[PDB]
Every structure is written in C-alpha cells, then in structure tokens.
Design a protein around this ligand. Structure first.
Ligand SMILES: *[B]1([C]([C][C][C][N]C([N])=[N])[N]C(=O)[C]([C]C2=[C][C]=C([C][N])[C]=[C]2)[N]C(=O)C2=[C][C]=[C][C]=[C]2)O[C][C]([O])[C]O1
Ligand SMILES: *[B]1([C]([C][C][C][N]C([N])=[N])[N]C(=O)[C]([C]C2=[C][C]=C([C][N])[C]=[C]2)[N]C(=O)C2=[C][C]=[C][C]=[C]2)O[C][C]([O])[C]O1
Lengths: 190, 193
C-alpha cells in the first residue's frame, strides 16, 4: 500500500557537556549535478523506515519541524511516507542539494557560523539517538564553502540533523566523501 | 590507518528448493552519467565477501562484494575506490565506471555471465548482521534508450549492496544495489554487469 513510513526517536535537544571528537579538516571539493562531492507531524526527529523482505528497516533519518518533514533526496527520492494514521506526501526537493520536503517547503533556516562547534544528533539503525560534538572542518568549493563533520556512522543514519548551541538544526548528515584512509566525512547540507 | 576492509562469508552457489518470490515489472527507466537511474598483497580467495568500515559504532557493513579470478568486484557508491584491507594486506582499486556504478580491485573486471533473458535467477543477499540467504525470482526488465536491462523486485536493507545475483549454474550474472523505487515505495534493483 505505502511501503515506507517514519517513527520518531525523541525531540531535538542540545546535550550540554556531551562528548567531543573529530578531525575538523579543511579540504577542497567538487560537486556533481547529482549531489555528489568529489576530490502525525509532531515536532521531532524521526527515522525513515521500509517494510521489506526482512520486514521493517531503517533507510535514513529525517526531522519534523512546524508541520513539515525534512530528509535527504537519496533516502526517499520523494516516496510516500505513511506517518501516523495517515499518509504524508512530497512538496519540494532538489537533487544537487540532495534534499526533500513533505507537506510544505524547507523550514530549516539556521546556518553554521564558521565559529561554533556543532553537534550531530545521530540516530543510527537499531540504536538510540546520540548527540556528539565536534569542530567541523570545511569543504572548499568553487562557489561558497560548506561546514564539514568528520564522523563515521553507519548506513541509515543519512539525514540526521546537525545542530547549533541554540538547539537549532543547521543542516543534515550523510552526504559527503571518504579520505584515503577510508574514514568518512559528511557535509552540513542545508 | 585503512578503515575499510572485507571479510569472506561463503561460497557463491545456486540453491535449489529455495524460497521463491517477487514481481516481474517490465518498466520504463533511464540513467544519468552519474549512475543514477531515474523513472518515467592482501588475500583474494573466491566467494562472496562482506565489506566493513570501522567507524564510531565499531565496525559496520557498508556493503557486499564478489571475489573471482584474483579480483574484487562491488558497487562504486559502496567504496568509490576506497582501499580495502584483507587478511594481512591491501587491495587497491584497479578499474571503475560510476555510470555502470562499479569498481574492480587489483585487476580488471572478470564476471562475464549475463542475463538469460527468460530464466529465473537467485539473489544471494548478504544483509548486515544477518544470514546470507538465497532467494529466487523471475526478473522484470528496465526498458531503456540503450536496450533492455534485467531487474529484480527484492527489497533488502541498506548494506546488502554489492551482493551477487546469479544463474542456475551459479554464474554471477550481476550485483544488487542500484535501482529505483516504484510509486509504492518498493525497491527494485538493476542486476548490473
Ligand atoms: B546513508 C549514508 C550515511 C553515511 C554513512 N555511511 C558511511 N559512513 N559510509 N550516506 C551515504 O551513503 C551517501 C549517500 C548519497 C547518495 C546519493 C547522493 C547524491 N548523489 C549523495 C549521497 N554516500 C556517501 O556519502 C559516500 C561517500 C563516499 C564514498 C561512498 C559513499 O545513505 C543511504 C542510506 O541512508 C544509508 O545511509
Ligand atoms: B545499498 C542500497 C541497497 C538498499 C536498498 N534500499 C532500500 N530501501 N530497499 N542501495 C542504495 O542506497 C543506492 C545507492 C546509490 C548511491 C549512488 C549512486 C550513484 N549513481 C547510485 C546508487 N540507491 C538506490 O538504489 C536508491 C533507490 C531508490 C531510492 C533511493 C535510492 O546498500 C548499502 C549502501 O546504501 C549502498 O547501496
């Protein structure tokens, strides 16, 4: 009927005095037209899920804010989410940004200062919501520069919110690149 | 040091008296030059291997791959030619093509077996923290600009990408992990050589 759905995993907070780790490197980065880098409805953080062959399972993470659900284009490619007792339908989304909006337009405004040390609210599969601080590094692109979080989490975390000391959501996890060592590193995609 | 590594998990074999299932959608699809479909020293023993990175939750299955005639094959989005430790030693990526969405390590591509056109196939899905299964289905196709391309309607977790579909004679007909979802949400995977 509608394979996918969301289930929530807490409200968005800043863990004061949480744990800190991360390389914070500055590195220069291309950007494909597909969004690749190179060289109901209650405010809260949800998990995107799918009823599959091995039954139910987490394909990514999205955040719910003022009536509107926000995740990453590659996670849903605007499929329909069966949120609560009713359906939930795409409104807008751009593949190069790698982002999607259900029910309304993009509601998330705050931005990385180039000063603040940020906080990833990771929500990995079969695991509980975790907060974690880091000095983000940077993605030196030809047009603009993007804040970058050196944090290796597993598949299905993609679309976890990155945060400001305020508690504000300043972009999403799980679009990035890997270094030579294999270490993962994500863009603060906004 | 070299986060990413692989671990063998068993033999590629066909398995008769397998559980049989799935649809066969003949569908109308096309794919950009980035690879995305869109709708309208280290040891190299044969068999199927799981792929692992070593991140902030320990060690997790990024994907899956097949290992044959001295060379490792998996999806390109899984590694993007990231180096892979195996046993005592490394495997450097040899060849690649993001459009196909493939990569080969320590030698060129080796798997030459290709879609029957008409005959049931088995997915040897090796999902994360779970038990490699064999499951059969009759493929649909994706009809395209550049001709028909076989595909299977088999919905499996993130991290099974790279895992081999194969023929009645165990010949790896192509990997799992690139595909698109029907309106419904259901995943459907192109079997990619
Ligand atoms: B995600 C996953 C979350 C990050 C965890 N993965 C790690 N550490 N290996 N993100 C990715 O897999 C992204 C996916 C992506 C798809 C499409 C586009 C638009 N062209 C952008 C990003 N891939 C990468 O970041 C990546 C980088 C370098 C090498 C390989 C892959 O994604 C899908 C599901 O949610 C599973 O988790
Ligand atoms: B796979 C993963 C297999 C899990 C299938 N998901 C569900 N929900 N049943 N496949 C994908 O995530 C691929 C990733 C991909 C990245 C980059 C490119 C660049 N051309 C192509 C493909 N994406 C899709 O198949 C897809 C389909 C429909 C909607 C969104 C995404 O397992 C581990 C990792 O995720 C890598 O692949």
């Amino acid at each position: 009927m509608v394979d996918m759905y969301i289930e929530r995993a807490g409200d968005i907070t800043w863990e004061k005095d949480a744990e800190v780790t991360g390389n914070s490197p500055r590195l220069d980065v291309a950007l494909d037209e597909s969004g690749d880098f190179s060289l109901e409805t209650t405010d809260g953080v949800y998990r995107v899920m799918t009823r599959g062959l091995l039954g139910s399972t987490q394909v990514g993470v999205g955040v719910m804010q003022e009536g509107v659900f926000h995740t990453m284009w590659h996670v849903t490619k605007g499929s329909a989410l069966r949120s609560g007792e009713g359906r939930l339908d795409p409104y807008w989304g751009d593949v190069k940004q790698d982002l999607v909006s259900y029910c309304g337009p993009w509601k998330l405004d705050a931005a990385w200062d180039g000063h603040s040390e940020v906080q990833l609210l990771a929500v990995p599969p079969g695991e509980r919501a975790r907060n974690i601080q880091t000095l983000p590094g940077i993605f030196k692109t030809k047009d603009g520069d993007i804040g970058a979080v050196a944090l290796d989490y597993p598949a299905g975390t993609s679309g976890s919110p990155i945060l400001d000391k305020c508690g504000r959501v300043i972009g999403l996890y799980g679009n990035g690149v890997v270094i030579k060592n294999g270490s993962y590193v994500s863009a603060i995609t906004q």
